[PDB]
Amino acid sequence: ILPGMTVKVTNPNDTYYQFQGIVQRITDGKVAVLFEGGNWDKLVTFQASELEPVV
Amino acid sequence: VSTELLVLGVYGALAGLYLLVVPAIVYAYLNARWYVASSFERAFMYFLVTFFFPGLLLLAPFINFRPQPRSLN
Amino acid sequence: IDLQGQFISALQSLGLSHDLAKLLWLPLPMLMMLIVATVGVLVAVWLERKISAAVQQRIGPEYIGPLGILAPLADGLKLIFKEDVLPANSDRWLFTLGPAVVVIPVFLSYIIVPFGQNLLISNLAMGVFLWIALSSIAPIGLLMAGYASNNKYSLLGGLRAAAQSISYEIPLALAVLAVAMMSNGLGTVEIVEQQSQYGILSWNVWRQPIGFLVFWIAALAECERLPFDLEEELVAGYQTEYAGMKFALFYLGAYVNLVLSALLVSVLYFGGWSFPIPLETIANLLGVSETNPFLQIAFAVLGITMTLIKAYFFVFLAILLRWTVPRVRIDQLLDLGWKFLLPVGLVNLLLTAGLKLAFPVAFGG
Amino acid sequence: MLLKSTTRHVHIYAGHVVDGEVHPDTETLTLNVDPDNELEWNEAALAKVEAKFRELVANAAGEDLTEYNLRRIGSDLEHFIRSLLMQGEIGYNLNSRVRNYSLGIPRVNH
Amino acid sequence: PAILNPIARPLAENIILTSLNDVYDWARLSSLWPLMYGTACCFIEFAAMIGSRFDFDRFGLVPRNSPRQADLIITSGTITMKMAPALVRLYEQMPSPKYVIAMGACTITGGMFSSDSYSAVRGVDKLIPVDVYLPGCPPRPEAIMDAIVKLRKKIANEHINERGNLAQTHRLFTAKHKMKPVPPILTGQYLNAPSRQAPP
Amino acid sequence: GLLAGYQFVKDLESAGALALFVPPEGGFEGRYQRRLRSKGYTTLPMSAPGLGDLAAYLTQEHGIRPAHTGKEDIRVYFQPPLVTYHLENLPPNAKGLVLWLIDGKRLSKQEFAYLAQLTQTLPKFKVVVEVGGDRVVRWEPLADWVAA
Amino acid sequence: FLNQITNYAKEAVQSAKYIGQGLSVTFDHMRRRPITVQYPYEKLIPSERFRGRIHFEFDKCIACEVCVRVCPINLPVVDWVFNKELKKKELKHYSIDFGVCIFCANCVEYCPTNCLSVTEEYELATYDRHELNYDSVAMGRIPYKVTQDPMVTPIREFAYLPAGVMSGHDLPAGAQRAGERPEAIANTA
């Protein structure tokens, strides 16, 4: 994947289910995902097999 | 063979049962159930801890009680 | 069997003078009872902590051992390592020996409680006197430590605790008197033998029901379970002046008094070393039980087990009723004591004497 | 009334140490410099600190014995200690149980 | 000198003494008796751990109101300079093996009262030697347990041969002053005052 | 308990960097940290999340900007390298130095190889990194943890 | 005079019945399981609203000095220089102290280019306070996930339980966020 695209988390075990995020950077096989909920910008990291690309 | 040797063997078996084989199964069952037991069974477990306490003082620093790790995909 | 007689015969076969051989035999049980008393104290501290956790729906001390059982041992090993601090006053030896005067007689009174026919230390005539007159000494050490405390609030709290402690000695003696009248004796061996003659129908709890409650209330007031005298008029009553060593000594002394009271209440009223089925019927049903020790050892273990479950039941009931009944003031406690336990104890002794003089068939005669 | 003001290094007690205790007396001010193991000291800088304390207690004359003036004297003493540390003199020691830079961190001039 | 604030420069052991030192450190790690001192909402955050939701008791820490049977003090809240000699005396009346955990943003530094303030103390490290700091306004109780874990990791660093550090040197000095005697401060005298019932 | 001997010191003197697995419920690395001081090593506590860059803080000097409130102007403080200044006025016996990182979980694997090369470049200080651990005390080579 | 004695006896038997009811509810309280959590074995799940550390990026920054005026203490500093080759300013260093931080997340809201971010870190314990001036390359690291750690046990809070649970410790199902997400409502209705 590339930093700057919209992805979606599809893991049924985590609390964030089908949330669109913004990829910030890629290192060590971990993806930083920035969520946009309300007026605060949270950044929760995930894995490379957890997310799916959404155009 | 005599009766005093049988009395000494009974004393040794009683000391071995008081020190080794009872606190092992007590330590097993105590964290085996630990939640489903009622108040009378909790009092029975606390009495089982209370009674064989010289066995617990010798079996305390050797045993380990820590949770097992899980697997992730 | 007789371990003392066999040890005496072995020392005579080795060759001795029958005096220095018999002199040194007593310190081994005299230290064994002390070390099992410290074992019971380390049991009772963990038991009180875990039961206070289980009442308020939480878990006690963990991550110290298997389940935290070494935490009373760790506390007793840490509190003797702390720096002994002293306030800005005089009489340092008095401040040191005050808690020693407190700790000596309550520890000394271990020669009274039995565990069987032979598993006891001293049963000469008057073990209840050696309990009461030795337990009535600790107010002197409390007032001595309050005078050596050099404070305006801790001295007043020590005076209030001493006035609370000395008031509950008279019904504590009258409830002993009400049982000693029926048992026609002051030793615990005859008292437990008159209960172990029959089974449940010879217990003193069903014969004197008011005196047992009076004795239990007096014991709970004496061992400072319901009276909180440790918010005591500024912060605490007889605290906030010692170090870890003197506080550890006071803590172990309070737990020794609690264990000794929980044993003595059951011994004087319910009865350790007893069974609901009489042992003579079981001995006649099994075989011949007069010289064979294979059943006698198991009977002694069963008597020790009965005494231990009675002591554990009384300890659990006391530490369950500590957080069950709410806290009452010390003035209301002294008022309820002096207005309840003395008149009903006196009329209980009167009706006990009347029932003994009326029908001397089921009583002690 | 025992008037005193101490933070971590200076102790200005308005009494007199007889053996191990103090008594209330408004005629003697006892100074204790660095009671905790935080800075290593010598005999010349401690004498300069004592001379600055004598100068500061000679400056404050004709005033009432209050906590504010004694705390101001202790603050000027700690400011003198900080300027003596910044002057190029004795500092921290690597022998304590805890190492917390309360006055400043070692930096580079150039 | 080109270096500001310089730092001055400052073996076989036995196995039985090492095991005795491990036992002596394990006893202090297992007991760890704290002191509850709080003047603000940080005291409420500390009391939320004593309840049956986080179980702060299970590590061995029991609540004591006595500043004499506690080998660890927990300062917490906004500290006024009028409370600073009170905190100094409460720290000095404790026994010698004592530890300091400072919880809060206004405790370890000035906090929010560092811009325009004249009464709040900007840092408790100017008063008592802090061993483990704890940032947060207010911090999580899991962060307080993490500070407890770091304090337990720091206690085991002590030695039984280098035990000669828990003391205070004398360095006494005696000088005279020329201050004026002050009138005493009010002690009581609120209700039965001569200017209260009688109107002037 | 377990009477531990002198084995972490030999594994620290043989390799250049070690990684020990401790239980996070309490403290057990303090025994080895005290045995290192008993063997004649000077310990240095340091936190691994707050370090900035390892090169500019361990080899060269850095510039710290203190948080001003608008009262003071923008000032810069010249901080020297920490382990170099700790190695300058170090030795009472001249045996060795160790560097202990407490929370080594919030780190990346890129600077670990640079730290393992830096502790092998200058043979006077060691690197000890702590991992959150799995139920037992075990030691592993840091270069093997980097390569695998 | 006898009516006061009967009233005292009624008060005594009522107090005895209250003591018995207190013993009954105390014995009732021993039946329920403990509802506490272990640390660091059962860590709580941070919500999407619970804030933490401030994460700073060195790429999507223009050094406009807007969030400094929003902060009441002005803790993020901007070390900007003026370049004559270009026409704008560039950022050299970025430092922020965390010991005086309020952690209210007010500078993150007033940011059009979302240069600041919320990071789920609360485990900050340091033996010294002089290292709290965090660098931008130190704030640009990866946060610690509570899910990927195999030694901890994940457990949600009270408001993250399906259809209403009062305990929230077992959680045998995999459902969360009790209600409905606003995506299937547009499909069905």
Ligand SMILES: CCCCCCCCCCCCCCCCCC(=O)OC[C@H](CO[C@@H]1O[C@H](CO[C@H]2O[C@H](CO)[C@H](O)[C@H](O)[C@H]2O)[C@H](O)[C@H](O)[C@H]1O)OC(=O)CCCCCCCCCCCCCCCCC
């Ligand atoms: C919640 C609270 C929890 C509480 C705590 C619970 C957990 C702890 C529970 C532990 C159990 C509690 C303690 C048990 C009760 C106390 C028993 C005791 O004190 O009891 C004291 C006993 C003594 O009691 C009895 O003592 C008798 C002597 O009594 C005489 O002396 C007594 C005074 O001591 C009385 O006066 C009595 O009337 C009088 O007859 C005999 O010795 C009996 O055998 C003995 O049972 O002490 C002994 O056990 C003797 C001491 C050890 C000596 C070792 C024996 C000597 C070695 C012999 C080896 C022989 C080797 C040669 C072999 C030959 C080979 C051919």
Ligand SMILES: CCCCCCCCCCCCCCCCCC(=O)OC[C@H](CO[C@@H]1O[C@H](CO[C@H]2O[C@H](CO)[C@H](O)[C@H](O)[C@H]2O)[C@H](O)[C@H](O)[C@H]1O)OC(=O)CCCCCCCCCCCCCCCCC
């Ligand atoms: C690494 C460290 C290793 C440490 C090594 C230490 C090893 C040695 C210590 C081990 C102790 C534990 C072993 C248990 C021994 C129990 C022997 C026993 O009770 O021996 C019994 C004898 C019986 O005594 C004799 O008993 C006779 C028969 O009387 C008995 O029977 C009569 C029947 O009417 C009466 O009831 C009378 O009261 C009652 O005592 C007479 O009383 C005699 O006077 C008397 O000599 O007691 C005696 O001599 C006195 C014996 C004192 C033992 C007290 C210990 C407490 C008992 C253990 C707790 C019970 C646990 C059992 C666990 C089993 C669980 C299923």
Ligand SMILES: CCCCCCCCCCCCCCCC(=O)OC[C@H](CO[C@@H]1O[C@H](CS(=O)(=O)O)[C@@H](O)[C@H](O)[C@H]1O)OC(=O)CCCCCCCCCCCCCCC
């Ligand atoms: C050849 C065999 C020899 C056997 C010798 C038996 C000696 C028993 C006593 C042990 C003494 C050494 C303990 C060292 C302490 C340590 O570092 O932590 C060891 C363990 C760590 O946990 C434990 O640690 C273990 C490993 S780990 O550390 O968790 O990783 C883990 O397995 C375990 O689950 C956990 O409980 O701590 C303990 O729980 C052990 C407690 C031992 C204390 C005994 C008290 C002594 C009382 C008598 C005192 C006399 C002196 C009186 C002075 C006036």
Ligand SMILES: CCCCCCCCCCCCCCCC(=O)OC[C@H](COP(=O)(O)OC[C@@H](O)CO)OC(=O)CCCCCCCCCCCCCCC
């Ligand atoms: C199997 C054995 C079970 C034994 C359990 C008994 C131990 C309980 C003792 C109580 C300790 C606390 C005393 C505090 C008591 C307390 O604080 O309140 C005492 C309360 C005081 O009330 P007041 O302050 O209103 O009274 C004084 C004022 O009236 C001034 O005018 O009333 C009493 O005086 C009556 C006492 C009755 C006490 C009854 C106790 C027994 C209740 C349980 C009966 C159980 C029967 C069981 C049958 C199976």
Ligand SMILES: CC1=C(/C=C/C(C)=C/C=C/C(C)=C/C=C/C=C(C)/C=C/C=C(C)/C=C/C2=C(C)CCCC2(C)C)C(C)(C)CCC1
């Ligand atoms: C043979 C034998 C044995 C056995 C044992 C047993 C069998 C025991 C058991 C028993 C038990 C197990 C006991 C215990 C008990 C306790 C309890 C249980 C208590 C508590 C309770 C309470 C205190 C309460 C109260 C009350 C009241 C009074 C009123 C009403 C209400 C109530 C009920 C709450 C052994 C193995 C040891 C060994 C040796 C031999």
Ligand code: SF4
């Ligand atoms: S740090 Fe925050 S929570 Fe703590 S005392 Fe200060 S204002 Fe209150």
Ligand code: SF4
């Ligand atoms: S973080 Fe945002 S407000 Fe602050 S200087 Fe960068 S772009 Fe401007």
Ligand code: SF4
């Ligand atoms: S959270 Fe508040 S105090 Fe912290 S940097 Fe942002 S604006 Fe300043």
